[PDB]
Write a protein that binds this ligand. Structure first.
Ligand SMILES: Cc1cc2nc3c(=O)[nH]c(=O)nc-3n(C[C@H](O)[C@H](O)[C@H](O)COP(=O)(O)OP(=O)(O)OC[C@H]3O[C@@H](n4cnc5c(N)ncnc54)[C@H](O)[C@@H]3O)c2cc1C
Ligand SMILES: Cc1cc2nc3c(=O)[nH]c(=O)nc-3n(C[C@H](O)[C@H](O)[C@H](O)COP(=O)(O)OP(=O)(O)OC[C@H]3O[C@@H](n4cnc5c(N)ncnc54)[C@H](O)[C@@H]3O)c2cc1C
Ligand SMILES: Cc1ncc(C[n+]2csc(CCOP(=O)(O)OP(=O)(O)O)c2C)c(N)n1
Ligand SMILES: Cc1ncc(C[n+]2csc(CCOP(=O)(O)OP(=O)(O)O)c2C)c(N)n1
Ligand SMILES: [Mg+2]
Ligand SMILES: [Mg+2]
Lengths: 546, 555
C-alpha cells in the first residue's frame, strides 16, 4: 500500500477526523490520500497559522475526544504553523501536525550549507522545544509505527502537540499492509480533610476539565454542596451554577477571589497556580486555608504555591478512584455556600455603568439570550478576552475557548472554523480590533463554507490591555471591520447601542449564518475588576467592590 | 544609563535605522527608549510576521548598507517572527530581531514545567537553527557586548539574521555608560582565473546572490561590461542587475531561454556567489554548462563542490575578490564580439510573448512595467507563485530599480509587508506584485499602507487559483485540484483594498492597466489593482523536470 494511503488510514482509525491545510508540493500526496479515503474532513485555509489554530480547536471543542490535524509544506508552511503548535503546547491540547519535506536524497544532511533542496527547512529543529514528540521519518518502514506512537503521545497524560516531518519520497513509497494490520491512604487523607473543613473550596484547573469523568465527578461535588472556582482553563468547561463562583485571579470575579482567600481548605485539581491565578504574592494564596494540590507533573507541584499536601495523580484516575459521595454529608457547609452565593449576588454586577456600552451588559445579554442554545464562544487576547472570561456564565451545552498560556492574538477567528467543523454547532467569536487583524483573511473561509460563526469585534480603537499599562493608540484611527466583513462576503453590521446588539444577536440565534458585528467601544479600555500594585487577589481595583 | 536606552543608542550607532513592531508588555521599555532617542524609526504593524518581513526589506532595499529591526514580545510575538527570520536566513540578508522576555526570576529555567511566567517561551530554542547568532541575556553586563557582537555577526561574511532575547528586568537595569563608550587569497589563483577568462572564446558570468550586495559589485560589473563579457544571474543575483545587452536575464527552470542558451554554450563559466541549486541547474547538474570549464567562487566551503562540481573552486569573499581583481586587467579577446552579438540576437528572438492566446499576457504586463517606469526610481516586491516567476523572467530593471524575492524559503505573504519596509528605508515608491493566494496571508498590512500614506502600488494578479501547485496537481494527480481551485470562487481584492481605505481598481484590459500605472507614477500613493487573470495558470518558459536547462517547455 502507498505510504500516504497508510497515513490516511491511520489518522482516521485514531480519531483524527478534521484537518486544515494550505497546500504545497510536498504535501500533495498526503492531501490526496486523505481526501480519497474521505474519513478525515480536510479544509483549505489561507494561512498555515490559521490552519494550525483551526486544527487546535478540534480537540478543544470536543473536550479531547477527537483530534485535529494541520498539514503544511516544508519551509514557510512549517514556520507558519508555529504559533498554533506553541498554543497547543502551553494549554496542553492534543493536535497532530504533519509537514511534508523534500526528498530524502535532497536533504542537506550534515553538509555546511543553509539548505540543499528547494524550500528545505528542518521543521523538527524548529518545534522540538514546543512539542511532546517531533521526528523526521528516515525510512518508509518507520512511518506507520512512528505515526501511531505520535498520536498516542499527543493524547496521553498531559496532552499536547506532536509533529512528523515526512519526506516526499517516503510519502510515495510502499509500506507492508500485513504489518500495518495511587495510595488508598492518600485518597482517604484527602477525604478526611474535606470532611472536617468548615469552608471547603475547589480550584478546578485545566488538567481536570478535559479528563474523562470530570462532569460526572463534579455532579457529585454539587450533591455534597461543595463550592468551587476555576482558572481560565478550567472555566472554559464549567456550566453556571450557584456553587460555581467563576474564574479566580487577576481578572477573576470578586466573589471567586473572596472564596479563595476565606476558605479553610482549598483542593486544587490540575492548576499551575501561575501568576495570573495568584497575583504577585503566591505566599498569600488561600491565606486561611490548608492547600492540597493534585497534578500529574511533579514539576508543577511545589512550584509557585507550595501546597500543604501534594499528590502526583493523573486526574481521570483520581475521578474513577474517588467518588465525592464518599465524603460524609455535612450541613455546616450550607452557611458557607449561602455566604458565597450572597457575595456573588452583590459583587457580580456592572462596574462600567458610566461607559456608553458596558462589557458586563454585553456579556450578560449573551448569557441571557443564548440560555437555550448549544454554542461555543472563542475568545481572542486583550481586555475583550478578560471581559468575557469574567462575565460569561455558560449554559448547559456551551463552552468557551482561550489561548491561556501563550495568549496569542489572532487565535479566535481561525479557531472558530475548527470549532464549528468539529463541534457541529454555532460559534460566537469575540475579538478586539487589534486581534481581529492578524488572521482577518480567514473570514473568507467562513463565507466560502457558509459557517454559522458570529464574529463580534469589540472595537475600542486601541491595543487596550497594553495601552492601559504611541504603539497602542493612533488618535482614534481604526480599520472599518464592518466593511472588511462585507468585502469578504460576510453579512456585517455596525453596532452602536445595546438595542442594536440585542437585535443582531437575536437574528443570529434565529438563523445562524456568517455574521460580523463591529461594536463601537472607544471608551472601553480597561477591565474591572483587575489586580494592581502587587496586591492580594481579594484586593482588586477599583477598590472595595468599586 | 538605563539598559533599554543603551540598546537604542547601540542600534542607531550601527546603522539599524528602521524597526517594525507589534507591541507587548515585555517590549515597552525597548520601544519607549527607541522612540525617545528618535534615530531609529519604529513603525507599528498588525502582525509580527509582517513586522519581520518589513524589517528584512530594510537591508534588501539598501543593498545591505542599512539594517532593519523587528521587535516582539515573548511567546506569540516571537513565534510570529519565525517565517521572516527563516527568509533572512535562507536568502542571507542581515536583520536584527529583539524579543522581550519575562523577568529573569520568572523564567522556568530547568524546571520540568512547560512555562513559568505569563507568556514565557524560549525564543532562542525556536530560532537557533535559522540564525547566525541567538542568545538570551543572563546579566545586564552582557547586553552591550552581546548586542554589538550580534549586529557584527549579522552583517559579516555571508549575512543573516540574529536574535537577542532580553528579560524585562535586564531592560530596566543600569549599565556602565563609560564602558559603552570605551583562508588567504593566492595571487596565483587570481592570475589563473584571469588567464582562463582571457583565453576563453565564449566567456560567461553567473552572478549570484553572494555577489550583488557585496561592496564594490556595481563598479566591478561596469568594468566587465567595458571588456564586453556577457552574464546571466540567479534569481537572487537578478534582483540587483540593470537591464543591458550583455545581461541575458535569469537562468534556470523559469529563466530566459537566452540565459539558459548562454550557459549551455559558453566555454568558460565564472560563478560568483551562487549555490547552483536545483532551480538554477534543473535535475541534471552533471549537464550544467556542458561545453564549459566552470570556476566557482564562494565564501563557504560547503557551497563549493556541492551539486555542481566546478573544474576550479576558490574560497574567496566576494567584496575582497572585487577589489583584488579589476576586470580591466583582462586582455580583450577578439572572438568575444561575435559571441556577445550571437547572444544579443538569441535574446532578441526568444525574449518574446509566449502567451499570445491568453486574455492578458504576463509578458505584456511586465514589458509595460519596464517601459512605463523607465525614468522612475522604484523597486518591485514579488510574492510566491506563477506570478513571481512571470516577474522574475520578464522584469528588465531600469537604472535605480531593484526587485526583491523570497528565493530560498519562497514564503507566500512576503510581498505586501516587505513593501512597507522597502518603502520606509528606500524612500522611494514600491510596486508589489502578488497572487491571489499570497495576497491573503498578510492582507491586514494594507491598513498600514493606508494609515502611513505610503506610495505603494499593490498589483494582485488574480487567476482564481493557487496556480503553481494547481499545475502540479493537473499533471501528476489527474486533475484532482480541490486544494488549489474552488470552481472560480475568489475574494474581492478591489473591495478588500477599499475596506482598508486604499484606492482600488479592477483591471480587465491592457489599457486599464496602463492607465492605472500612469496614474500611480504621476502621483505615487496607496493604490491596489486587481488584475483579472483566470486563464493565466502557468509559466512559459518552464522546465519539465529531468530535462536540461536549454530544453524548456513549451518546446
Ligand atoms: C490576557 C490574559 C489574562 C489572563 N488572566 C487570567 C486570570 O485572571 N485568571 C486565570 O485563571 N487565568 C488567566 N489567564 C490564563 C493563564 O495565563 C493560564 O493560561 C491559566 O490560568 C492556567 O490554567 P491552569 O493552570 O488551570 O491550566 P493549564 O495551564 O492547562 O495547567 C494544567 C495543569 O494541570 C496539570 N495536568 C494536566 N493534565 C492533567 C491530568 N490529566 N492529570 C493531572 N494533572 C494534569 C498540568 O501538569 C498543569 O500543572 C490569562 C491569560 C491571558 C492571555
Ligand atoms: C517559485 C520559485 C521559483 C524559482 N525559480 C528559480 C529559477 O528559475 N532560477 C533561479 O535562479 N532561482 C529560482 N528560484 C530561487 C532559488 O530557489 C534560489 O533562491 C536561488 O537560485 C539562489 O540564488 P543564489 O545561489 O545566487 O543566492 P543565495 O541563495 O543567496 O546563495 C548565495 C551563495 O553565495 C555565497 N555567498 C554569500 N555571500 C558571499 C560573499 N560575500 N562572498 C562570497 N560568497 C558569498 C553563499 O555561500 C552561497 O553559496 C526560485 C524560487 C522560487 C520561490
Ligand atoms: C501575537 C501577539 N502579539 C502581541 C500580544 C500582546 N498583547 C496582549 S493584549 C494586546 C492588545 C490587544 O488589543 P485588542 O485586540 O484590540 O484588544 P483590547 O485589549 O483592546 O480589547 C497585545 C498587543 C499578543 N498577546 N499576541
Ligand atoms: C506560506 C506558503 N505556503 C505554501 C506555499 C506553497 N506554494 C507555492 S506557490 C503556491 C500557490 C501560489 O498561489 P498564488 O499566490 O495565487 O499565485 P499563482 O501561482 O496562482 O500566481 C503555494 C501554495 C508557499 N510557497 N508558501
Ligand atoms: Mg482594542
Ligand atoms: Mg493565483
Amino acid at each position: 500500500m502507498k505510504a500516504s494511503d497508510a497515513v490516511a488510514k491511520i489518522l482516521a482509525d485514531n480519531n483524527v477526523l478534521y484537518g486544515f491545510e494550505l497546500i504545497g508540493g510536498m504535501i500533495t500526496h498526503l492531501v490526496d490520500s486523505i481526501n480519497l479515503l474521505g474519513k478525515t474532513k480536510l479544509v483549505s485555509m489561507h494561512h498555515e497559522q490559521g490552519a494550525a489554530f483551526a486544527a487546535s480547536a478540534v480537540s478543544r471543542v470536543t473536550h479531547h475526544k477527537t483530534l485535529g490535524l494541520a498539514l503544511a509544506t516544508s519551509g514557510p508552511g512549517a514556520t507558519n504553523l508555529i504559533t498554533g503548535i506553541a498554543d497547543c503546547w502551553l494549554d496542553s491540547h492534543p493536535c497532530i501536525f504533519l509537514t511534508g519535506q523534500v526528498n530524502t536524497h535532497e536533504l542537506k544532511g550534515k553538509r555546511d550549507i543553509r539548505q540543499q533542496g528547494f524550500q528545505e527547512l528542518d521543521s523538527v529543529a524548529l518545534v522540538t522545544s514546543i512539542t511532546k514528540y517531533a521526528y523526521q521519518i528516515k525510512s518508509a518502514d518507520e512511518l506507520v509505527p512512528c505515526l501511531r506512537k505520535a498520536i498516542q503521545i499527543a493524547k496521553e497524560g498531559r496532552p499536547g502537540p506532536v509533529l512528523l516531518d515526512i519526506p516526499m519520497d517516503i510519502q510515495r513509497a510502499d509500506i507492508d499492509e500485513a504489518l500495518l494490520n495511587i495510595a488508598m491512604s492518600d485518597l482517604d487523607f484527602i477525604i478526611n480533610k474535606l470532611q472536617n473543613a468548615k469552608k471547603p473550596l475547589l480550584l478546578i484547573g485545566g488538567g481536570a476539565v478535559n479528563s474523562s469523568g470530570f462532569q460526572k465527578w463534579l455532579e457529585q461535588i454539587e450533591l455534597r454542596g461543595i463550592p468551587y472556582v476555576a482558572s481560565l482553563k478550567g472555566a472554559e468547561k464549567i456550566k453556571a451554577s450557584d456553587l460555581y463562583l467563576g474564574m479566580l485571579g487577576a481578572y477573576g470575579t470578586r466573589a471567586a477571589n473572596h472564596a479563595v482567600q476565606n476558605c479553610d481548605l482549598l483542593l486544587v485539581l490540575g492548576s499551575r497556580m501561575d501568576v495570573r491565578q495568584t497575583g504577585a504574592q503566591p505566599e498569600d494564596f488561600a491565606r486561611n486555608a490548608e492547600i492540597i494540590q493534585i497534578d500529574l507533573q511533579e514539576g508543577q507541584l511545589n512550584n509557585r504555591v507550595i501546597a500543604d499536601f501534594s499528590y502526583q495523580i493523573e486526574l481521570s484516575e483520581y475521578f474513577s478512584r474517588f467518588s465525592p459521595l464518599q465524603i460524609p454529608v455535612n450541613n455546616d457547609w450550607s452557611v458557607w455556600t449561602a455566604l458565597l452565593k450572597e457575595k456573588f449576588r452583590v459583587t457580580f454586577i456592572d462596574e462600567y455603568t458610566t461607559w456608553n456600552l458596558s462589557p458586563f451588559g454585553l456579556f450578560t445579554q449573551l448569557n441571557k439570550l443564548t440560555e437555550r442554545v448549544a454554542l461555543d464562544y472563542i475568545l481572542d487576547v486583550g481586555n475583550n478576552q478578560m471581559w468575557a472570561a469574567h462575565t460569561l456564565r455558560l449554559n448547559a451545552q456551551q463552552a468557551m475557548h482561550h489561548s491561556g498560556g501563550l495568549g496569542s492574538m489572532g487565535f479566535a477567528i481561525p479557531a472558530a472554523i475548527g470549532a464549528c467543523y468539529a463541534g457541529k454547532k454555532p460559534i460566537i467569536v469575540i475579538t478586539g480590533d487589534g486581534g481581529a487583524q492578524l488572521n482577518i483573511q480567514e473570514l473568507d473561509i467562513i463565507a466560502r463554507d457558509k459557517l454559522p460563526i458570529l464574529t463580534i469585534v469589540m472595537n475600542n480603537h486601541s491595543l487596550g490591555m497594553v495601552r492601559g499599562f504611541s504603539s497602542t493608540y493612533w488618535n482614534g484611527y481604526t480599520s472599518q471591520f464592518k466593511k472588511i466583513g462585507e468585502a469578504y462576503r460576510v453579512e456585517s453590521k455596525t453596532i452602536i447601542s445595546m438595542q442594536a446588539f440585542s437585535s443582531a444577536l437575536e437574528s443570529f440565534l434565529e438563523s445562524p449564518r456568517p455574521l460580523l458585528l463591529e461594536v463601537s467601544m472607544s471608551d472601553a479600555r480597561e477591565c474591572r475588576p483587575r489586580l494592581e500594585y502587587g496586591r492580594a487577589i481579594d484586593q482588586q481595583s477599583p477598590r472595595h467592590d468599586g
